[PDB]
Symmetry: none
Subunit: 39 residues, 2 copies
């Protein structure tokens, strides 16, 4: 089944990665935004 899309640490800047099905979400610290916390 689907693997772990967080294994590559896609979330920058201390963001917490949650694995989804063929995708991932980043939970960013306050005041970082963007899909990977890059803003």
């Amino acid at each position: 089944v689907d693997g772990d899309q967080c294994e590559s640490n896609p979330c920058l800047n201390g963001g917490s990665c949650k694995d989804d099905i063929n995708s991932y979400e980043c939970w960013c610290p306050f005041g970082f935004e963007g899909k990977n916390c890059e803003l």
Copy 2:
């Protein structure tokens, strides 16, 4: 704001880089150590 300090792949020897705020961390394979898995 803060950039991706994993730019340029600082972790050696198969290590995995995680971007933090103004810093990065490496996970290193068993048998390797140092900040950048260089020891």
